[PDB]
RNA sequence: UCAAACUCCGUGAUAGCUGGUUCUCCCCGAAAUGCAUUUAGGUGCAGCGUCGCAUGUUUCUUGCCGGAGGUAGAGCUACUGGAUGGCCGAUGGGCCCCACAGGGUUACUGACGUCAGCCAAACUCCGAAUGCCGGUAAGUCCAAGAGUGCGGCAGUGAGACGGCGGGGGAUAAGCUCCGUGCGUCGAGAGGGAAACAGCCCAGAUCGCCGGCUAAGGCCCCUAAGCGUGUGCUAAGUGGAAAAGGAU
RNA sequence: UUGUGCGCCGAUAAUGUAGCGGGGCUCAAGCACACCGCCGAAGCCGCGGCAGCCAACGUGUUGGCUGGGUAGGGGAGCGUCC
RNA sequence: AGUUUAACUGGGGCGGUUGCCUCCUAAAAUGUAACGGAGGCGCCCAAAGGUUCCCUCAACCUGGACGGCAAUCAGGUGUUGAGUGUAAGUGCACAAGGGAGCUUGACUGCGAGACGGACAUGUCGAGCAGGGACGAAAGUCGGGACUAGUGAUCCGGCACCUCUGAGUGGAAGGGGUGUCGCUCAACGGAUAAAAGGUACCCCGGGGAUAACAGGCUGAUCUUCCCCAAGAGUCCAUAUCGACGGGAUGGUUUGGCACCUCGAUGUCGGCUCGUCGCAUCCUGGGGCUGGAGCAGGUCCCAAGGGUUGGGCUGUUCGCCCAUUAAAGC
RNA sequence: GUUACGGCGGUCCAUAGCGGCAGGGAAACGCCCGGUCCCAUCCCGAACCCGGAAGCUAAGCCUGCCAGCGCCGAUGAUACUACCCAUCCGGGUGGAAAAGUAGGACACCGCCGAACAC
């Protein structure tokens, strides 16, 4: 149902789109986690920044 | 010697050495061919040396096809000149050769002499290469 | 010769990941 | 550019009872200079000018 | 010992300026161009330099009319 | 002391030039690009910064729909040019029958066409991704401390290397010149790289004789594994290297 | 005879080993594939103090976000003399 | 006597160039540099402009008097390969190509909204009004198929105006509208007006910038190798091994310009060394087209030694006389 | 409504074209007769224009047939590529050609008019 996010890497060496999209998801620091919907918006952001986030699934 | 009789633009960029062959990846007109494996620019004098190497190793009768022609020049500029001040003049002519591409094709009956000849012509070239039969 | 090569070949280490500055 | 006696020469085109010089640059190795011409002047209307330099 | 080349000509900023979908007022310039790469259709006019422009407001539709890419304008819906 | 002395005065001459410019903390924070230039080491305006007011999310991101492109690539009896090998032989031509006309012959040179395989930054019947322009739907939202307009106050306008794409060069340079919502250094410490501005990780409010992790690494020097399992290596390979040679 | 994974020769400069960072290592302390743990930074967390922007409330309390910084812009202050 | 005498530039100089248009580079929007690659312009135009109407070429096949490869003609195929005033591109057969008749819009007064945009410049512009052209009318015409064909400002000049007229009335003069006068081409144009030397040189600065040296690369140079056409009486490999190819070393002529110009003292000689081996002799050795003496080529090998003299400033070199040998 | 009819148009304009075979002419489309009248040839009533209906569907045109000259054209794979991993090599998530192939296709649609009829 919902996706659970965990930021792993850092935003340094990282481009504008990746940085702005972490901001979009609400992630600023490392080890922050977010409970986000699994809609197309979210899936596209994760496709964008998969190397920065571990993604788990409650559902 | 191999050169064209005239090119429209006699100062060209350097060809690219990126990608694999699209055509000439299949022996066409003979029986025993040469196939490249690397990227390289092959000139006029190399191919002359190679065809002579083959004809002096069969020596009588048996045909040789050259599926390449040096239709792309390169520009040396005269010696001990500081960089700048233009682009040098064409002096030698290359053909680009992408991997998979076929250069030579022989038609001589005995495989012994033929394979040997192609090897002598391989050792006149800058590329790693191998020998091909028309078969699958 | 030697010096430039050893620079350009120390770059292929593991903690550099294939790249270094001024080669 | 300059004022040389260029092939494309001459100017001034004055009006009869119409003082509104209309200008045009033309050649002069051809014959003519006493016919054609027309245009709108001040207070007046579509009437006939000379090429008078 | 000279390179007799070197010259060039400054740009002219050609190409499309109002793509598909957009809202354009009147007299606005859709494309600047040398030849009629794109031709006029409906509610569209041509210039002297083969520029195009709008004659009626609306929105764009780059369609073809017998093999030639056109430009058009369609009626917006009044609010 | 002389390619035009010395002293006082003008005179505190002037220098697009070199140097130097003193106490503290708080907040934000660049640039090394463009056009012009008697100009290229300087400067003016635009660019990027901040302060104040105004306009309130208009900026940015992701998804979906609509639009032009002629790049990579590929293709060519789809045009302009190059070009490999065959078939024919007009047309040419040695030569023969000898009028030379005309009848022809012979590897002859081979159009044009024709079978097959090919190349191209200034060749394209074709044609990707990304990027781009607008619309829409949400997201971020006690914020990005975003955007736009205005006015004050400026600095910069000598950029470097690394990745990707490219020109000049010898497809050499720690070479030079352009691109890039790519990066870092500049202005950025700390850890790793043996030492090492630009590489990888990560962006330092101050303290703690607290804990978990990344890159990297665990025989001793050096804190952590002479760790487990299955195979290869005999060269000190590991811990530089080619064409090529070799039971 | 094909394709592979490690290997051999080719190999070769001048102060001193000197092209593992050293000792040393094949009774791998070397290469590969999987597995287990761990060490490790000024990163994140944990306990505390200060500060700036915003917001909520009450007669200045709390909370979230934030706080590297040169050219430079702005703000708030110590000190000396009369 | 006072002063000028340009800049770019892979140091400067010599050369070349400076503005505008077109194409590629240019990386599928726009834009983008180099002393990068190819060209062109500093015009022409009673029509080569406007409008109404009409038609389609080039090429090939054939026939055909001079006539041939081609001239004008006729008949077919011919979607467009010709031509478009002038370079190239984009377009043009629905023609913007070709042709014929009228003809002056190659006008005046304006201009919504837009592009591009440092700025000044620059580009199109529907639509309104007078007064017209053409056409039966609809409608098109504010130059040319499009983009280049030219130069800001100041100062003067010509025509017209119902603007002003230094007490009044006039006038000069100054204005205004339309217009002219510049290879100011170094083309955003320091003056209307300006070429050179300095080894007599001086000052301020710069490693932003060159020469010696270091450094990077290694075209070039040296050393070495690969393959083997042949030479070698035959015999590819005793010896030389072409045509091509691959690497070293960093000493050579050069490329870049990274530290040093608020000082790194530059050719050779002398004296004094020390190091490498890609070895001149000595020492050990394999093959021979090595009988023997002398050798030729190859491998290992650095301990020691490696002359004195003539010419040249010379390094290098040549010569003389010796040497076990007269090293790089 | 309808037939082998005519005319005006359209398709992001060849799936519609070219060529061959057969076949049709009621009214219409045509070709044809001739230059008296308007009008016209850079010369020509050939064309344009005018006046009529002797003649023929031969041609144009419409209908069916032939997938042959041309065109259209996928799925899947490949090339290339955005992003990420990766000490050179190469690889993973997504996107996705050209060519080739299977095949398609001798067009489709709209309006008015005729003829034909209840």
UniProtKB/Swiss-Prot annotation, chain A:
Record protein name field: Large ribosomal subunit protein uL30
Single biological process term from Gene Ontology: translation
Ribosomal protein listed as a keyword: yes
One GO cellular component, as annotated: cytosolic large ribosomal subunit
Disulfide bonds listed in the record: none
Family: Belongs to the universal ribosomal protein uL30 family.
CDD domains in alphabetical order: Ribosomal_L30
Gene expressing this chain: rpmD
NCBIfam families: rpmD_bact (TIGR01308)
Subunit (UniProt): Part of the 50S ribosomal subunit.
Organism in which the protein naturally occurs: Mycolicibacterium smegmatis (strain ATCC 700084 / mc(2)155) (Mycobacterium smegmatis)
Keywords (A to Z) from UniProt: Ribonucleoprotein, Ribosomal protein
Gene3D superfamilies tied to this protein: Ribosomal protein L30, ferredoxin-like fold domain
Family matches, as PROSITE patterns: RIBOSOMAL_L30
InterPro entries linked to this entry: Ribo_uL30_ferredoxin-like_sf, Ribosomal_uL30_bac-type, Ribosomal_uL30_CS, Ribosomal_uL30_ferredoxin-like
GO molecular function ontology, one term from the record: structural constituent of ribosome
Curated annotation (Swiss-Prot), chain B:
GO biological process: translation
Pfam families xrefs: Ribosomal_L16
SUPFAM superfamilies from the UniProt entry: Ribosomal protein L16p/L10e
Keyword field: Ribonucleoprotein, Ribosomal protein, RNA-binding, rRNA-binding, tRNA-binding
Single GO MF annotation: structural constituent of ribosome
Origin superkingdom: Bacteria
Region (Disordered) location: 1-24
GO CC terms, sorted: cytosolic large ribosomal subunit
Biased composition (Basic residues): 1-13
InterPro entries in alphabetical order: Ribosomal_uL16, Ribosomal_uL16_bact-type, Ribosomal_uL16_CS, Ribosomal_uL16_dom, Ribosomal_uL16_sf
HAMAP family hit by this protein: Ribosomal_uL16 (MF_01342)
Protein family per UniProt: Belongs to the universal ribosomal protein uL16 family.
Subunit (UniProt): Part of the 50S ribosomal subunit.
UniProt function note: Binds 23S rRNA and is also seen to make contacts with the A and possibly P site tRNAs.
PANTHER family: 50S/60S RIBOSOMAL PROTEIN L16, LARGE RIBOSOMAL SUBUNIT PROTEIN UL16M
Record's protein name: Large ribosomal subunit protein uL16
Curated annotation (Swiss-Prot), chain D:
Gene Ontology molecular functions: structural constituent of ribosome
One GO location term (cellular component): cytosolic large ribosomal subunit
Keywords, sorted A to Z: Ribonucleoprotein, Ribosomal protein
SUPFAM superfamilies referenced in this protein's UniProt entry, alphabetically: Zn-binding ribosomal proteins
GO biological process, one term: translation
Record-linked InterPro entries: Ribosomal_bL33, Ribosomal_bL33_CS, Ribosomal_bL33_sf, Ribosomal_zn-bd
Family of this protein: Belongs to the bacterial ribosomal protein bL33 family.
Protein name, UniProt field: Large ribosomal subunit protein bL33B
Curated annotation (Swiss-Prot), chain E:
GO biological processes: translation
GO molecular function terms attached to this record: structural constituent of ribosome
Keyword Ribonucleoprotein carried by entry: yes
GO CC terms in record: cytosolic large ribosomal subunit
Signal peptide residue numbers: none
Keywords: Ribonucleoprotein, Ribosomal protein
Membership in a protein family: Belongs to the bacterial ribosomal protein bL27 family.
Name used for this protein in its record: Large ribosomal subunit protein bL27
Organism: Mycolicibacterium smegmatis (strain ATCC 700084 / mc(2)155) (Mycobacterium smegmatis)
Gene this protein is translated from: rpmA
